Design an enzyme around this catalytic site. Structure first.
Site, PDB file in Angstrom:
ATOM      1  N   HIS A  41      50.396  70.150  63.946  1.00 56.90           N
ATOM      2  CA  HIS A  41      50.298  68.702  63.797  1.00 56.90           C
ATOM      3  C   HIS A  41      51.361  67.949  64.590  1.00 56.90           C
ATOM      4  CE1 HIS A  41      53.689  68.122  60.975  1.00 56.90           C
ATOM      5  NE2 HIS A  41      53.169  68.968  60.100  1.00 56.90           N
ATOM      6  N   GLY A 143      61.252  65.115  58.895  1.00 56.72           N
ATOM      7  CA  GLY A 143      61.804  65.956  59.942  1.00 56.72           C
ATOM      8  C   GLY A 143      61.991  67.411  59.574  1.00 56.72           C
ATOM      9  N   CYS A 145      59.582  69.636  58.788  1.00 58.67           N
ATOM     10  CA  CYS A 145      58.488  70.534  59.150  1.00 58.67           C
ATOM     11  C   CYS A 145      58.941  71.580  60.156  1.00 58.67           C
ATOM     12  CB  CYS A 145      57.307  69.752  59.703  1.00 58.67           C
ATOM     13  SG  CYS A 145      56.532  68.818  58.421  1.00 58.67           S
TER      14      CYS A 145
HETATM   15  C1  LIG Z   1      57.417  67.248  58.387  1.00 55.32           C
HETATM   16  N1  LIG Z   1      58.372  67.036  59.209  1.00 55.32           N
HETATM   17  C2  LIG Z   1      57.200  66.279  57.226  1.00 55.32           C
HETATM   18  C3  LIG Z   1      57.821  66.775  55.917  1.00 55.32           C
HETATM   19  C4  LIG Z   1      57.528  65.842  54.743  1.00 55.32           C
HETATM   20  C5  LIG Z   1      58.254  64.481  54.719  1.00 55.32           C
HETATM   21  C6  LIG Z   1      58.522  64.201  53.231  1.00 55.32           C
HETATM   22  N2  LIG Z   1      58.464  65.531  52.626  1.00 55.32           N
HETATM   23  C7  LIG Z   1      57.919  66.483  53.409  1.00 55.32           C
HETATM   24  O1  LIG Z   1      57.768  67.675  53.099  1.00 55.32           O
HETATM   25  N3  LIG Z   1      55.741  66.154  57.098  1.00 55.32           N
HETATM   26  C8  LIG Z   1      54.901  65.409  57.840  1.00 55.32           C
HETATM   27  O2  LIG Z   1      55.298  64.770  58.832  1.00 55.32           O
HETATM   28  C9  LIG Z   1      53.429  65.377  57.436  1.00 55.32           C
HETATM   29  C10 LIG Z   1      52.535  65.294  58.696  1.00 55.32           C
HETATM   30  C11 LIG Z   1      51.136  65.593  58.255  1.00 55.32           C
HETATM   31  C12 LIG Z   1      50.222  64.567  58.003  1.00 55.32           C
HETATM   32  C13 LIG Z   1      48.946  64.862  57.550  1.00 55.32           C
HETATM   33  C14 LIG Z   1      48.584  66.186  57.318  1.00 55.32           C
HETATM   34 CL1  LIG Z   1      46.983  66.524  56.740  1.00 55.32          CL
HETATM   35  C15 LIG Z   1      49.500  67.211  57.537  1.00 55.32           C
HETATM   36 CL2  LIG Z   1      49.089  68.894  57.253  1.00 55.32          CL
HETATM   37  C16 LIG Z   1      50.773  66.911  57.989  1.00 55.32           C
HETATM   38  N4  LIG Z   1      53.128  64.291  56.520  1.00 55.32           N
HETATM   39  C17 LIG Z   1      53.152  64.447  55.178  1.00 55.32           C
HETATM   40  O3  LIG Z   1      53.579  65.479  54.635  1.00 55.32           O
HETATM   41  C18 LIG Z   1      52.629  63.262  54.346  1.00 55.32           C
HETATM   42  N5  LIG Z   1      51.797  63.761  53.260  1.00 55.32           N
HETATM   43  C19 LIG Z   1      50.423  63.662  53.370  1.00 55.32           C
HETATM   44  O4  LIG Z   1      49.896  62.961  54.258  1.00 55.32           O
HETATM   45  N6  LIG Z   1      49.736  64.385  52.447  1.00 55.32           N
HETATM   46  C20 LIG Z   1      48.265  64.382  52.250  1.00 55.32           C
HETATM   47  C21 LIG Z   1      47.787  63.025  51.704  1.00 55.32           C
HETATM   48  C22 LIG Z   1      47.542  64.725  53.565  1.00 55.32           C
HETATM   49  C23 LIG Z   1      47.980  65.480  51.214  1.00 55.32           C
HETATM   50  C24 LIG Z   1      53.767  62.325  53.806  1.00 55.32           C
HETATM   51  C25 LIG Z   1      54.550  63.073  52.710  1.00 55.32           C
HETATM   52  C26 LIG Z   1      53.130  61.072  53.171  1.00 55.32           C
HETATM   53  C27 LIG Z   1      54.743  61.900  54.922  1.00 55.32           C
END
Ligand code: A1B20
Ligand code: A1B20
Lengths: 306, 306
Positions: A41, A143, A145
């Site tokens: 991603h 950050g 990930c």
């Molecule tokens: C990675 N660097 C970062 C880590 C997060 C930030 C807060 N806590 C963590 O563990 N994650 C992301 O940038 C990630 C990108 C992303 C978006 C969408 C999808 Cl489907 C994936 Cl696999 C990855 N974003 C998120 O983790 C995001 N959560 C979601 O969008 N979750 C659902 C709704 C798709 C289940 C936030 C936590 C809102 C940033």
């Protein structure tokens, strides 16, 4: 004596963390030999996440769209490919600090250490378990990930987890190092929620053995029970069923303490039914399920790594 | 999101651990530049421990009585001296992996990471606090002496603890790296016991702020209190008194959450008086006092180290 949430020493893994930038997105990568592994991603923009076609997104990138930094050294990207949900960036330099390693897909109930990283730089290490619902209860900020989870076996680093996302309940989801998600999750922003979690019974029993080894005996009793009588009670309290393989795994702890597994189960059954009544076990007022039988042996016998 | 007992990455310290043998006793040493630091009780036999004269014991040793191993390399001991309760062995080779470091004597309430070692080999890392009674609640087995406690500040390793002994209640006692014991303990086998311990109030408040940051708000209320009204209650429950310096230290957490320190104190006062009533905070059913305000900031803001 004593009992702590103990993580593996992280030195062998710290030397493999790098920073990966694509566009405006920066996260962490794992540099082993001449390959950098990171979540795919990283190649997405905000508009792509609703339904990304990753094959299309990757074909429109070139090697110079990927900025990879190891400390202050820039690594030159000479190839790129995708394996499931991980991106593999081939670089012109093999990491001289590459440890002996392997990639392992773990099962629910197993534990591992997480090296939490930001911008390629290690921030902290902690221990967690892969829950029965295939999430982990981690601690992650923006950050993070590409931070990885690992175990150490003698001289070998077993990588088992790479961090991808946080779910709405505040728990975390990711992949093995071949890019397969644990659980039913997918890397597209769609409604996803963790299933209901259960308590890892075999780990609770291991931790009760740890308590006995450390002098906490107040919960013991003279009774014994059967597997099927225990499991009928466990089910009601949302505990995983106990199998004969679980019993055998607890053998070493049963032998060191002289308390039969099915004896320990009768104590747990009582604790489930009457609560701990304002008492504590190993400094906790809840039953703890994130220590495996091997964690307890390792920490109550003193295994080291080289 | 999330909140874990997070230790510092241990890589910079793993490269400084060596094995030290004198006679039949083997324990761990810390190798920095051309000096190996270890507990001085390594020079004692069983008969000496009842009342050892360490000056006499050291004058009867020669450089070749000390076997120092770094992995498989033997280090040649060319000098030896004593500083308080630590032995300093001068060796013919400076550790090429010596980090930027300093030696620091910490105060009760502060936290640090322990790298637990056996035979010079790292076994695990965990976080603990120096209790008000100058013990730590560690996890240590035979052969762990000379394991060290440390913090990391940017690029600098601050060593603050070296492990010497376990007390009869199962808690642990040691020295700073200049050989001064924390607390009233001495390295002669005589009756010694830890004083009564208290709960580290400023740390409990930090952890309640961490809970708010992570969405646990059920314990908040609309009241406020004064320092002197709070402290009168704290004393009864065996909590350390809160000072104005403690209030100021919590400033950053008060500001990020919008809850005044004295507001948070009224919540804690209620929790002390009515208990948590089968509820949990950050997954715990007891109030946790081994996170400092800085630990919380670091883990809820994302500080890294280089
Ligand atoms: C990675 N660097 C970062 C880590 C997060 C930030 C807060 N806590 C963590 O563990 N994650 C992301 O940038 C990630 C990108 C992303 C978006 C969408 C999808 Cl489907 C994936 Cl696999 C990855 N974003 C998120 O983790 C995001 N959560 C979601 O969008 N979750 C659902 C709704 C798709 C289940 C936030 C936590 C809102 C940033
Ligand atoms: C160090 N390698 C080892 C670590 C111990 C083993 C179990 N848990 C630990 O933390 N410690 C020792 O070898 C140590 C040597 C020693 C003896 C006497 C004195 Cl005064 C000192 Cl400073 C050090 N022995 C012990 O820790 C010992 N405890 C005591 O003897 N304690 C009192 C009675 C002196 C307070 C045992 C735990 C009984 C081995």
């Amino acid at each position: 004596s004593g009992f702590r949430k103990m993580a593996f020493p992280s030195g062998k893994v710290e030397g493999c963390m790098v920073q990966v930038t694509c566009g405006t997105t920066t996260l962490n990568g794992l540099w082993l030999d001449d390959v950098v592994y990171c979540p795919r991603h990283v190649i997405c923009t905000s508009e792509d996440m609703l339904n990304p076609n990753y094959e299309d997104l990757l074909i429109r990138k070139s090697n110079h769209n990927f900025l990879v930094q190891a400390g202050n050294v820039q690594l030159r990207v000479i190839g790129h490919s995708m394996q499931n949900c991980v991106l593999k960036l081939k670089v012109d330099t093999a990491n001289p600090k590459t440890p002996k390693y392997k990639f392992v897909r773990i099962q629910p109930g197993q534990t591992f250490s997480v090296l939490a990283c930001y911008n390629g730089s290690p921030s902290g290490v902690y221990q967690c378990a892969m829950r029965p619902n295939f999430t982990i209860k981690g601690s992650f900020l923006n950050g993070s990930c590409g931070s990885v989870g690992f175990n150490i076996d003698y001289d070998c680093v077993s990588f088992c987890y790479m961090h991808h996302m946080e779910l709405p309940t505040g728990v975390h989801a990711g992949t093995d190092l071949e890019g397969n998600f644990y659980g039913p999750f997918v890397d597209r922003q769609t409604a996803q929620a963790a299933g209901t979690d259960t308590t890892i019974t075999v780990n609770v029993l291991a931790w009760l053995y740890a308590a006995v080894i450390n002098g906490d005996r107040w919960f013991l009793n003279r009774f014994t029970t059967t597997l099927n009588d225990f499991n009928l009670v466990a089910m009601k309290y949302n505990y995983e069923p106990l199998t004969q393989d679980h019993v055998d795994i607890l053998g070493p702890l049963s032998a060191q303490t002289g308390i039969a597994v099915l004896d320990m189960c009768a104590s747990l059954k009582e604790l489930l039914q009457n609560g701990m009544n304002g008492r504590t076990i190993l400094g906790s007022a809840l039953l703890e399920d994130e220590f495996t039988p091997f964690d307890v042996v390792r920490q109550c016998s003193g295994v080291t790594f080289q």
